[PDB]
Write a protein that binds this ligand. Structure first.
Ligand code: HDD
Ligand code: HDD
Lengths: 726, 726
């Protein structure tokens, strides 16, 4: 019942490209990768090799194949305590998934600042460019269950737990710089509207349904984040290729007590890249685990996800200086007005050992701040502070959630709190209260100060009556949506139009579509007309006369809002499909593989069956997957080397592979006789931008392909795709 | 007052076909559809129209848009009890999902027997053909979470709660007649192996991964249910078009105390029908809720799902008369040996009101039997009896899950059990123990009897030592897989071959593929060779020499094991895509639509945009969805009426629609000029079986199409589709 004699059951404990080895728990794959937090989990990591199988009580089991019965065809006996322990534990494996962001993928890593920020913050983790702070990061979707798909259109979560020497700091952000709503009190209304509808629990992972567009049409504050969700930001290529944002204005507090307003940013060093909608959708079926898998494999390959932490900083005296309210989380701060200052780099360099223990049980909460940080009055942030503590009581079984290993501080924690379900800490303090004389008052309060001080809130002035009232300054809904729209490239605009058109086409009640289109007419008439057309709606004269909203502080556009306007391509960690034939020209493959390796681009070798093919020079080529098993959806570009092309010329799946990649705007490269495939995707003999062709795969051929891959997708091809049946 | 003044926000309370109206809670959609259980839920149904919005304590809310703060831009106050109640309930909405069958869709209905079964069972619900028993049924997948996709390849659950006059009877079955393993002690090993792998939590909703095939390769008892899952059984068209089975041998006990062994069956009156793999997988992406949705809409349309309950019955004296053990749940009872006797009909005729409250909280458990039934020593069933009670303690929060309204018996329940979390029932009995004199010993035990008696177990003889030992009678693994294989049509066999080839191709460790192939070589060499070819694996002479397993009691096949060998087509409730153009020939549409209506087949009118198109004669045609919005995956056939075909002849989506429908073997009909599309799918001028074509949609056109639909798919097309790129 055992391992194969060759040791091929066990993956190498070395960095390896996606698909080369089976994936494995982080500590077995990369045992020499360490940080303070990873090491501190060693008390609870449990091995297996050479150990006897036991009950949870430590009793060795002799027969784990059978229940205890009265004769071998008889009834099962109640005294079989081994069976009931095993079954009882199985029967209770599940815990409540998170209310929102139930679907997510996580990894370990570390953070360090570029330079001390003690001028603006006394936060210890930002005080020294050579103090490393471990992190645990969870990326997520928002609406779907823990078993929903990755590549849905949705906001993405981006939560980072920093295990600092002065306490845990959780920066709990999303991949867009705003949220749908203004006050936490409306959170259950918004989330109930986007979630599956309550009578039938449909649809999963989709805002494309009546209730969501109902709420949107009636709550125009939502339109800004909806524009982002309908843009390609809603369907990222990978969690490594999206931005992160804290959304709210927080405060930094320095040693001298000065407060500075701050918004948080994460910049992806692998660049910004998203899928296209037909590709993302079809991908939730071909591989609902695509982003989870891609993150885990990138880490196993050494393509560590890296992010730059950046701050937008606004002096206190500048609170009222924009034409929007800094505390309104439906408003972004344009980088043209306030630049992002580089703060530090985060590297994710190890996967967890057990998803449930480390990922599913992790609890992030934006109230977990540290000295040198503070809140503001943002009314959405204010209510979040209540929820993230409260929800852990059911999700994680009670108030000792900070004792679940993933959640534990690596710095000291001591206080007079006691008991609770599943209490691990055994307190020896004679006192469980303070003030106490019986333990000389320990543990003791600590005055605030420059470093290692107690937490004291910034003494912000509060003046007003007790009111349930929206600030009048929040009552503007169109100008940020319009600034975002004007900042996208024409093809990004087209995809926004297509997203609204596609979603609203799935709204059954036509008046809801109409009301949404009327809201679009208040943002931008070209957008509104283009959506209306697709819905067979005609704008009224009044609608055509709606005055567009004002510019944002004089800005006609801000290109930092676009995924693609300013190139920031990085091909390392991307992947190519190489479509094999039964007689590959080995000279082509040599050159292809060598150029890709030089840029850290991975390859997957595909064929019409599994096993091996032999190349022209006798090289045996192992096959990663079939053309159907690993579709073009899962790769960044497609290369077809020369060889016996007749072998694959009339294979439907091979031809379709190229048609799907073509439709989805990916680079394709055809060497020698592989150019016969140009007829399948209707390329003229002259060739075209985005299809690489030559007599063979040489220096030039690969350089070309790699240049296209750095530009991500071939946007100039878009007019040519609506005619192809794919 | 936000409803549209035309009342179009509210769906009509009358049966309407899929897509015609928004879906609704069953009691608002079909208020006159009643049964005793639905009626008994009235005490907890909560309405809404005309009511003031309140806290849960009944306090009217004035402003549900804002938190209470100090100043309208000030901090949120802890005294906002309205905010905290509303966020608290939200923060705790989730409960743990089911350990297995997390993904399920459910409906209300009723059951009635055809005639009294008093001669063979004293079960009250089967005693009288005029006794109607309310039921609640949940259908499910097995592996994936509650938010996973419906049309995965997996076993399906089919669980029926009968609310009988003598107690709840739960018939908790699946859509295949056996299970993967023999003894309940291995259920967590099997389930852990099929579920997402523990390091990374991948893959969702798929057995296509290493650990599953590792376990199967090492436990040949699994192979029979694996054959079922690899066939088109693993991807049903609808919950209305699969079979249901209790799997285990149970007992019926009559008034005279005679036991008869029984296996339970559900026959779908809508026939057996499945998807094909490429369609199924793509549909998990285009509509992960397809089966849930199809069930709900069939019920709203009046196409109620109906099933006939049947029994395979075996006298006690025949226990040992088969080549396999009756208590072995890896073995089926071939209907050629033991016919299914028709017992009664179940009709599902109303959707729930609230999915969480009725579907998510429902608790089914096969130990919930009633006098007139009993168990056997089947060692899988024996362990199930422990699990389904235990698991509710966490899932539903304690031992009072029977007081959750969907779970309550409709008949009396009284006992001495008290307290527990969530206790609803307020006991007034002076006594909470028996025997007692202080309440005259009430409630009292009831002797067994012909009717309305207490439950007494059949006094089966037990003789043996206390052993953890598998019966040697269970040690045969191959002959049932082989009988199943030999019973399939050739196209079914090919689909089995492709299901194994596709799954093993996702298994990263090659030695596991090889070991599975070797197991197949023990079942049937043709199967094993065909899967080996697809994997690039060469059978050894030893493997080519393995002698096949014996016939099952002289059977070389049983056609009842095939989905399609014996025609059982039913078109009612199926759906057709109609591809419109901007000037449709109205006479064609009249003929098509009326022909479909007469046979209970639905239509969806599709185009390149939403809104309307106008026919030749000026009739205005409402568009249901776009070609891309409602892909051919979601229909059973496609009809292209004549008109201005030039409108759509160059539309990539229109073309691809037909290519996808064609690849997946679906009937396609083309009228007048729509026949120019013949070139898109490569049909010969003189046409082919499975393509209907004529000058118009008059005469025999619609009959020919409906005939194809009654046969489900165009299996003869299979050799044609391999070369088409779609
Ligand atoms: C007042 C309610 C509330 C509102 C207004 C917000 N959140 Fe939240 N959030 C929760 C209440 C909550 C929560 C219900 O507490 C969750 C799910 C359950 C839990 O553990 O946290 C959560 C989870 C959650 C996660 C997933 C953390 C993880 O991976 O485990 C992220 C990334 C965010 N939130 C980010 C945001 C952003 C960017 C918001 C707007 C700027 C926001 N939340 C507003
Ligand atoms: C000893 C463990 C055990 C084993 C051997 C089985 N089950 Fe089971 N089953 C459970 C333990 C369990 C459970 C974990 O207790 C579940 C999930 C949560 C629940 O309430 O019951 C369940 C759920 C469950 C459901 C879903 C009910 C619903 O819709 O809520 C169905 C249809 C079945 N089972 C059917 C089967 C079949 C056909 C089996 C093999 C013949 C089988 N079970 C063996």
């Amino acid at each position: 019942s055992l391992a194969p004699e060759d040791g091929s059951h066990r993956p190498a404990a070395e960095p390896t490209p996606p698909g080369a080895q089976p994936t494995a728990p982080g500590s077995l794959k990369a045992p020499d990768t360490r940080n303070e937090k990873l090491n501190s989990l060693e008390d609870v990591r449990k091995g297996s090799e050479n150990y006897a199988l036991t009950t949870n009580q430590g009793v060795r089991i002799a027969d784990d194949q059978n229940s205890l019965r009265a004769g071998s065809r008889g009834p099962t006996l109640l005294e079989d305590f081994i069976l009931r322990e095993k079954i009882t534990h199985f029967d209770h494996e599940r815990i409540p998934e998170r209310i929102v962001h139930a679907r997510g993928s996580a990894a370990h890593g570390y953070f360090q600042p570029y330079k001390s920020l003690s001028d603006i913050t006394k936060a210890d983790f930002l005080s020294d460019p050579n103090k490393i702070t471990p992190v645990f990061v969870r990326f997520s979707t928002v609406q779907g269950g823990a078993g929903s798909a990755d590549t849905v259109r949705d906001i993405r979560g981006f939560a980072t737990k920093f295990y600092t020497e002065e306490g845990i700091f959780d920066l709990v952000g999303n991949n867009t710089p705003i949220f749908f709503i203004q006050d936490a009190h409306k959170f259950p209304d918004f989330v109930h509207a986007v979630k599956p509808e309550p009578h039938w629990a449909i649809p999963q992972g989709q805002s494309a349904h009546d209730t969501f567009w109902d709420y949107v049409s009636l709550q125009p504050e939502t339109l800004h984040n909806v524009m982002w969700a309908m843009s390609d930001r809603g369907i990222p290529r990978s969690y490594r290729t999206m931005e992160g944002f804290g959304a709210h204005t927080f405060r930094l507090i320095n040693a001298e007590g000065k407060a500075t307003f701050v918004r948080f940013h994460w910049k992806p060093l692998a660049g910004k890249a998203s899928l296209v909608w037909d590709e993302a959708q079809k991908l939730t079926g071909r591989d609902p685990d695509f982003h989870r898998r891609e993150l885990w494999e990138a880490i196993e390959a050494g393509d560590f996800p890296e992010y730059e932490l950046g701050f937008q900083l606004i002096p206190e005296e500048d609170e009222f200086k924009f034409d929007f309210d800094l505390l309104d989380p439906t408003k972004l701060i344009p980088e043209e007005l306030v630049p992002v200052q580089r703060v530090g780099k985060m590297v994710l360099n190890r996967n967890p050992d057990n998803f449930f223990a480390e990922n599913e049980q992790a609890a992030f909460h934006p109230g977990h701040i540290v000295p040198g940080l503070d809140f503001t009055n943002d009314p959405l942030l204010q209510g979040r502070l209540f929820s993230y503590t409260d929800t852990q009581i059911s999700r994680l079984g009670g108030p000792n959630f900070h004792e679940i290993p993933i959640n534990r501080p690596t710095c000291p924690y001591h206080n007079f709190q006691r008991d609770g379900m599943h209490r691990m800490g055994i307190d020896t303090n004679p006192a469980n209260y303070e003030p106490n004389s019986i333990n000389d008052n320990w543990p003791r309060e600590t005055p605030p100060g420059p470093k290692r001080g107690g937490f004291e809130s910034y003494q912000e002035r509060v003046e007003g009556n007790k009111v349930r009232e929206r600030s009048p300054s929040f009552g503007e809904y169109y100008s940020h949506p319009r600034l975002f729209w004007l900042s996208q490239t024409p093809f990004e605009q087209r995809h926004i139009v297509d997203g609204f058109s596609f979603e609203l086409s799935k709204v059954v009640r036509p008046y809801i579509r109409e009301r949404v289109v009327d809201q679009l007419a208040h943002i931008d008439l070209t957008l509104a007309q283009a959506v209306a057309k697709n819905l067979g709606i005609e704008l009224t004269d009044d609608q055509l006369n709606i005055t567009p909203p004002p510019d944002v502080n004089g800005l006609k556009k801000d290109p930092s809002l676009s995924l693609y306007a300013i190139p920031d391509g990085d091909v390392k960690g991307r992947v190519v499909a190489i479509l094999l034939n039964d007689e590959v020209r080995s000279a082509d493959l040599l050159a292809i593989l060598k150029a890709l390796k030089a840029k850290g681009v991975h390859a997957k070798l595909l064929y019409s069956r599994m096993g091996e093919v032999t190349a022209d020079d006798g090289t045996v080529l192992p096959i990663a997957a079939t053309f159907a098993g690993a579709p073009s959806l899962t790769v960044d570009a497609v290369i077809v080397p020369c060889g016996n092309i007749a072998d694959i010329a009339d294979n439907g799946d091979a031809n379709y592979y190229l048609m799907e990649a073509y439709k989805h705007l990916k680079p394709i490269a055809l060497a020698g006789d592989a150019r016969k495939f140009k007829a399948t995707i209707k390329i003229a003999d002259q060739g075209e931008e985005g299809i690489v062709e030559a007599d063979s795969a040489d220096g030039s051929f690969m350089d070309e392909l790699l240049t296209l891959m750095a530009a991500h997708r071939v946007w100039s091809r878009i007019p040519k795709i609506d005619k192809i049946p794919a």
